[PDB]
Nucleic acid binder design. Structure first.
Ligand SMILES: [Mg+2]
Ligand SMILES: [Mg+2]
Ligand SMILES: [Mg+2]
Ligand SMILES: [Mg+2]
Ligand SMILES: [Mg+2]
Ligand SMILES: [Mg+2]
Ligand SMILES: [Mg+2]
Ligand SMILES: [Mg+2]
Ligand SMILES: [Mg+2]
Ligand SMILES: [Mg+2]
Ligand SMILES: [Mg+2]
Ligand SMILES: [Mg+2]
Ligand SMILES: [Mg+2]
Ligand SMILES: [Mg+2]
Ligand SMILES: [Mg+2]
Ligand SMILES: [Mg+2]
Ligand SMILES: [Mg+2]
Ligand SMILES: [Mg+2]
Ligand SMILES: [Mg+2]
Ligand SMILES: [Mg+2]
Ligand SMILES: [Mg+2]
Ligand SMILES: [Mg+2]
Ligand SMILES: [Mg+2]
Ligand SMILES: [Mg+2]
Lengths: 305, 99, 116, 72, 158, 326
RNA sequence: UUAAGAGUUAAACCUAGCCAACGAUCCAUAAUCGAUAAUGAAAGUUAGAACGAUCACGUUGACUCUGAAAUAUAGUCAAUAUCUAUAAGAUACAGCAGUGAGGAAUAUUGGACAAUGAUCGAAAGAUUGAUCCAGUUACUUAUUAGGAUGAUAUAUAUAUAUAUAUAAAUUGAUUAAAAAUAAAAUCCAUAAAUAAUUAAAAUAAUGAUAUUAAUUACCAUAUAUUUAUAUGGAUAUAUAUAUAUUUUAAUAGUCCUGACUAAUAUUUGUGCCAGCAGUCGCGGUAACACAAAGAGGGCGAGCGUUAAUCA
RNA sequence: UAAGAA
């Protein structure tokens, strides 16, 4: 069974009563107004909890279920408010007990309906500079930096590149005041990555799950045989799962052509083998088909492969 | 570079008259300048109002003159007097009967 | 060109986007018919070079893939290259200046260099 | 129910239902016949296309105009 | 296009690669010994038996395989000018350069093909005798008595 | 692509990839997707409806069905909570440049990210890319023009008329405060200190205050009332005619009226509910650069595909798109 | 006879065989296939348009010459049908355009040989309806086809929950009944245009496409490695030089909402009529199904429908 | 990598 269901709020709100013939209003609009609170002469909603950004590295994600859909607060004292019968905003008659003891995992959960979405941890500029110095100056391998700071290796390399770009931009005075204010207000919104904590440091033993293993296979053997990861790897015809981590932690003859004055291009001839080189004859044409191959040029132009 | 006018081809008018292919009517679009004949490219000629075949022929003959090759008029091939091969038998049948 | 066996270019790709197979073909078969052998590929469009890289001084690259040992075999048994293929093979070092023509005949800024 | 016998260009003579509120089909009219039976008329296994040939589209049609040969 | 799965998912075809040497050569002792071996009889026999007479106009034996002598093939296909030289003219020089290049390429191709065939035979013999050892090592390593085999019930006497 | 139409309808209540205020309320009032009392088709349809409203709404149904992958990618940890495999139903959209920009928070929406790409403001490891469908591979660095990012993340720049009216109101309130302070400084000091006591130290003003005299009220100066009718159309005039302790020599929100955002840059309103740091990108906000580390994966207890819907909704949507809605 | 086997074709002699219910002979129908297309979990099934491979034919039939190879789009004879030149004549568009017909239905009487080939030539070059481009056509597939903000308009009066009043307020409705952040307005863009250049397809030279793509929003140069500040040619101004340095948007249909099957905000007309319908079925005064308004659900430069294929 | 419905 299914009907159209206007997405009314799941929490109580005061609905319209008798309306002046010319109001022309909807209950959804009133629900939004109550959620937002009064709008300033400046076009601002100071009374709404979520109007302003946090500043203490504790994200201010929505909690419509814990707080019963009461999103209003005093902007200066931050104390909860409620809409009284007379159309004013005052203290709640009773205090909420679900808004003080909030599980620390819930504070990093952007969406109330998805427990598996959590925000990442921002790295402090000091840690990023430390990693950049370690990788570039002291020449420490990315594996041991990853282990020391508990960061996945691609993230470490990305940090190195991003810090290099930042260094260039700072040497050129391209980081304007607006950019610095934006960066620092964004940085104070998210939790800060802590190298020392065990539960805040990234797991460093992850490997992709290939299709080959995903199928469950079972072996019946004598009751006392040992059967370890290496035997399992042999059975599935794969490298053992430890060499996968080990390998993830880490000729053709060519002839360049004679250029002469006035010639606008050079020829390089790469050696190939007959029966493997060429455009095949009677190959599948997909240009009129839904999976036609689209690629991008070295200049970023969309081309048809 | 711009080559030297020769005694065989003193003026641009002489060049046009020698290459032929009814480019004699194209003497006006040039200002009779050796530099104009030997510096104008295909796009300039297209702007000036030269048709495709004429400008391609002129560029070919200008190149020949640059590399010291004769610029005598090559004539575009024509059909036989008795029509083309596919219509030759019919034409000759009608021609011999009528004469 | 002459002879029954000829090394020439067979057109592939879309309209306004030519690519070519370097092929050994019977002289009578169609240009895009299945040949005796596909010796390689040829992309006539040079690889784009950035303007800063033009300041550096790189030359745009025209890409040619080729089976050199088999191409020399086909030249040996008498196959006749076309004009464009003749140009391609002369600049690859397979053919020497004896295959040049009067029109095609100059200071060398770079020298044909073989790498591994 | 409004129907008509129609002789097709392939020579077969069929019975075709005429959909829509009102029709202007008459003897010797040129029509176009598609598949689709009229369920409550036995023997009529084809439909005439409104808005094609000499059969005009339904007059003052608002909804489903394309099914009845009506312009916007 | 699921047939392409049978060919590495490659759509379209190439012309089949021509063989530079169209018959086995003389420097290939394996094929020579194989053809020159006794011919079997019985259920897998190849030819006519001792007392059986073949059809009147037919040949009892398959045609004689004619092995290639690459030295002779080069000698006849591309022989160098027996005259010392002429060395005049311009087109004559162009033709001389072209002819020597063509000849050089053709000897190179023929001899490299010879070498590749013989090298392939050597490699295949080594591969066979390396597999024949790896397989035996594996079968024997599945013969080392495992202690856990004491838990598999046995009735060897019966 | 689809023409944006009623993307923020409160009655429909679909959640979009956007920092919009109406989108924020739609997300807030939602609750969960109600799957009870529904046939399997109705469940799958509801799931598809909601999840496609969020993930890649601007893609046509047929294009999305073409780019949909039954393959779901996950990582096994070799050193327990259940891996939410089917939150990867829409992971393939995350390698698109327009989604990468939105996850990097370089655009207020995927739609705005598309426009930023199409107008030439985006680069992928050096080369300008003008095609939103462009797909990033691991390790690719992309960047956005900093003004575009600052405008996406910043507050709207007011027009002259609106800012001038706001500043008129500023003058009136400042003068009212000055009068109240001058007449009765006792009660004003009392209220000021009481409010300082009430407020939390989170405000910077409290920290600065931690860091009676009748002379105080003598420093407060009235501000002349402005009438905009005569002042209309002349920005250099109104700029010098406004002088307040907080905003000095500029009309409200237009400190430098040649940049594309609220010029004394402050974050856009309602930014914190959507401020989510992705796990598959590294973001440098000073340079407005980012690196695409990997395709999002699911691990025990977590999925890196950011979504406002629970595992059952994505399961039902995945069932829908496996069979083309059969 | 043939280069060559064979009742292959011709001649002679013999023997009485050969095929066939695991389907002969006969009849009908059909070009065949793929590393091609569709579909499906797959086995498979379908197509054989496109790309490629093979065969056959060039109005119909037989024969002959030449040739390595031809019953050749050749020649001879005949048939059919047209033209005149009225002859032991020519032509046969299944080459490219194009016309008429048939049909539900399938386009230019286009440009260039610039590229890749092919023919002739010693070469210079000539020819090429191959080919390459363009035209027509939503036939198919892509990409774009605008983002952010946005529920009022007037008045009066180093702080900040601004507060008072007067106007108005479209359709539906009297609250979980909405249309609707939708409009309008606001901010910021880009496309197009406008100018400057301008590669690449091709080089020894040649560019049909072509009012090319791409780039720059005055032009260069001179250093840094795209963002910069400088030196010099522009630039009207006011009075060489402080200044600025093109303009600039927004355009969706079509089907459906009783169940199968997504569509709850309800109303009006008709009254077993008119009609609807893929299946069950709906319509007899209270129609969620007919015809419509409001609202709503799909897909979207398409949507529906018919014909078909696969599942 | 095999779903059914009236
Ligand atoms: Mg329903
Ligand atoms: Mg002549
Ligand atoms: Mg020749
Ligand atoms: Mg209808
Ligand atoms: Mg015989
Ligand atoms: Mg006989
Ligand atoms: Mg039979
Ligand atoms: Mg037939
Ligand atoms: Mg068939
Ligand atoms: Mg075909
Ligand atoms: Mg065809
Ligand atoms: Mg024939
Ligand atoms: Mg005909
Ligand atoms: Mg015939
Ligand atoms: Mg024709
Ligand atoms: Mg007709
Ligand atoms: Mg040509
Ligand atoms: Mg022509
Ligand atoms: Mg009303
Ligand atoms: Mg009624
Ligand atoms: Mg119905
Ligand atoms: Mg109806
Ligand atoms: Mg309506
Ligand atoms: Mg489309």
């Amino acid at each position: 069974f299914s009907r159209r269901r206007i997405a009314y709020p799941f929490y109580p709100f005061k609905k319209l009563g008798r309306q002046h013939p010319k109001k022309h209003d909807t209950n959804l609009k009133t629900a939004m107004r109550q959620f937002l609170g009064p709008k300033n002469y400046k076009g601002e909603y100071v009374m709404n909890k979520y109007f302003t950004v946090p500043t203490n590295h504790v994200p201010n994600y929505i909690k419509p279920d814990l707080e019963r859909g009461q999103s209003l607060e005093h902007p200066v004292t931050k104390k909860p408010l409620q809409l009284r019968y007379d159309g004013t905003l005052g203290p709640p008659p009773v205090e909420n007990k679900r808004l003080q003891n909030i599980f620390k995992d819930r504070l990093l959960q952007p969406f109330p309906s998805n427990p598996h979405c959590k925000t990442n941890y921002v790295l402090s500029p000091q840690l990023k500079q430390s990693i950049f110095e370690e990788i570039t100056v002291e020449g420490l391998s990315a594996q041991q930096v990853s282990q020391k700071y508990g960061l996945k290796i691609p993230r470490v390399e990305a940090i190195v590149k991003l810090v290099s770009v930042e260094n260039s931009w700072n040497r050129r005075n391209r980081v304007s005041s607006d950019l610095k204010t934006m960066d620092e207000t964004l940085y104070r919104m998210f939790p800060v990555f802590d190298s020392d904590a065990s539960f805040k440091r990234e797991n460093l033993s992850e490997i992709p799950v290939p299709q080959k293993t995903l199928a469950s296979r079972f072996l019946t053997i004598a009751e006392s045989e040992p059967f370890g990861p290496v035997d399992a790897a042999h059975v599935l015809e794969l490298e053992p799962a430890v060499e996968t981590l080990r390998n993830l932690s880490t000729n053709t003859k060519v002839i360049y052509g004679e250029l002469v004055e006035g010639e606008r291009s050079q020829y390089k001839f790469t050696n190939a083998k007959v029966g493997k080189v060429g455009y095949r004859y009677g190959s599948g044409n997909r240009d009129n088909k839904k999976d036609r191959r689209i690629g991008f040029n070295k200049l970023g132009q969309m081309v048809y492969i | 570079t711009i080559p030297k006018p020769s005694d065989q081809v003193p003026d641009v008018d002489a060049f046009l008259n020698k290459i032929g292919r009814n480019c004699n009517e194209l003497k006006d679009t040039f200002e009779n300048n050796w530099n104009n004949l030997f510096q104008w490219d295909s796009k300039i000629l297209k702007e000036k109002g030269v048709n495709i075949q004429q400008r391609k022929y002129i560029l070919k003959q200008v190149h020949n003159y640059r590399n010291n090759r004769p610029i005598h008029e090559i004539k575009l091939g024509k059909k036989s007097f008795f029509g083309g091969e596919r219509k030759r038998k019919a034409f000759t049948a009608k021609w011999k009967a009528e004469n | 060109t002459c002879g029954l066996v000829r090394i020439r270019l067979a057109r592939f790709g879309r309209k306004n986007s030519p690519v070519y197979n370097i092929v050994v073909a019977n002289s009578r078969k169609a240009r895009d018919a299945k040949p005796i052998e596909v010796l390689g590929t040829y992309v006539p469009v040079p690889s784009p070079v950035t303007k800063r890289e033009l300041k550096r001084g790189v030359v745009p690259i025209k890409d040619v893939k080729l089976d050199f040992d088999r191409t020399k075999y086909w030249i040996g048994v008498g196959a006749q290259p076309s004009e464009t293929v003749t140009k391609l093979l002369r600049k690859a070092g397979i053919l020497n200046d004896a295959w040049a023509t009067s029109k095609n005949s100059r200071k060398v800024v770079f020298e044909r260099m073989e790498t591994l | 129910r409004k129907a008509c016998r129609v002789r097709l260009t392939n020579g077969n003579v069929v019975s075709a239902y005429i959909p829509g509120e009102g029709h202007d089909a008459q003897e010797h009219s040129i029509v176009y016949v598609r598949g689709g039976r009229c369920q409550d008329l036995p023997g009529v296994k084809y439909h005439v296309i409104r808005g094609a040939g000499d059969l005009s589209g339904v007059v003052n049609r608002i909804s489903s105009r394309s099914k009845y040969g009506a312009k916007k | 296009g699921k047939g392409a799965a049978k060919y590495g998912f490659k759509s379209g075809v190439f012309p089949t690669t021509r063989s530079i040497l169209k018959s086995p050569t003389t420097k290939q002792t394996d094929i020579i010994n194989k053809v020159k071996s006794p011919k079997p009889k019985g259920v897998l026999g190849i030819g006519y038996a001792k007392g059986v007479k073949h059809p009147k106009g037919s040949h009892r034996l398959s045609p004689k395989v004619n092995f290639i002598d690459v030295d002779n093939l080069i000698a006849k296909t591309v022989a160098e000018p027996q005259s010392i030289k002429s060395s005049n003219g311009s087109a004559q020089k162009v033709r001389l350069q072209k002819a020597e290049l063509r000849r050089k390429f053709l000897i190179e191709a023929f001899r490299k093909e010879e070498a590749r065939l013989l090298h392939k035979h050597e490699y295949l013999q080594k591969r066979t005798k390396e597999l024949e050892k790896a397989k035996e090592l594996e079968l024997e390593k599945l013969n080392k008595e495992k202690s856990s085999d004491l838990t598999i019930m046995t009735l060897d006497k019966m | 692509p689809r023409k944006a139409n009623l993307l923020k309808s409160l009655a429909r209540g679909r959640v979009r990839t956007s920092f919009n205020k109406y989108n924020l309320f739609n997300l807030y009032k939602k609750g969960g997707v109600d799957l009870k009392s529904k046939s399997l088709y109705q469940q799958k349809w509801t799931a598809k409806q909601e999840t496609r409203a969020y993930h890649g709404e601007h893609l046509t149904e047929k294009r999305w069905q073409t780019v949909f992958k039954p393959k779901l990618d996950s990582v096994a940890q070799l050193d327990i909570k259940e891996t939410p495999f089917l939150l990867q139903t829409f992971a393939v959209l995350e390698k698109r440049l327009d989604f990468a920009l939105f996850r990097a928070m370089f655009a207020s929406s995927v739609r705005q990210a598309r426009q930023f790409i199409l107008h030439g403001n985006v680069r992928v490891n050096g080369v300008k890319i003008k095609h939103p469908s462009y797909t990033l591979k691991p390790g690719d660095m992309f960047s956005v023009k900093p003004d575009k990012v600052l405008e996406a993340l910043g507050a709207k720049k007011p027009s002259f008329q609106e800012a001038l009216k706001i500043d008129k109101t500023q003058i009136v309130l400042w003068n009212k405060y000055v009068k109240e302070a001058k007449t009765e400084p006792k009660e004003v000091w009392e209220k000021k200190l009481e409010n300082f006591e009430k407020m939390s130290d989170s405000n910077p003003k409290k920290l600065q205050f931690q860091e009676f005299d009748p002379k105080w009220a003598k420093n407060l100066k009235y501000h002349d009332p402005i009438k905009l009718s005569e002042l209309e159309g002349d920005e250099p005039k109104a700029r010098k005619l406004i002088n307040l302790p907080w905003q000095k020599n500029y009309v409200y929100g237009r400190q430098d009226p040649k940049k594309p955002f609220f010029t004394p840059w402050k974050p856009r309103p309602f930014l914190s509910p959507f401020a989510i740091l992705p796990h598959h990108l590294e973001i440098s906000f000073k340079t407005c650069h980012a690196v695409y580390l990997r395709d999002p994966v699911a691990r025990p207890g977590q999925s890196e595909v950011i979504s406002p819907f629970d595992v059952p909704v994505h399961e039902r949507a995945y069932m829908y798109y496996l069979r083309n809605g059969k």
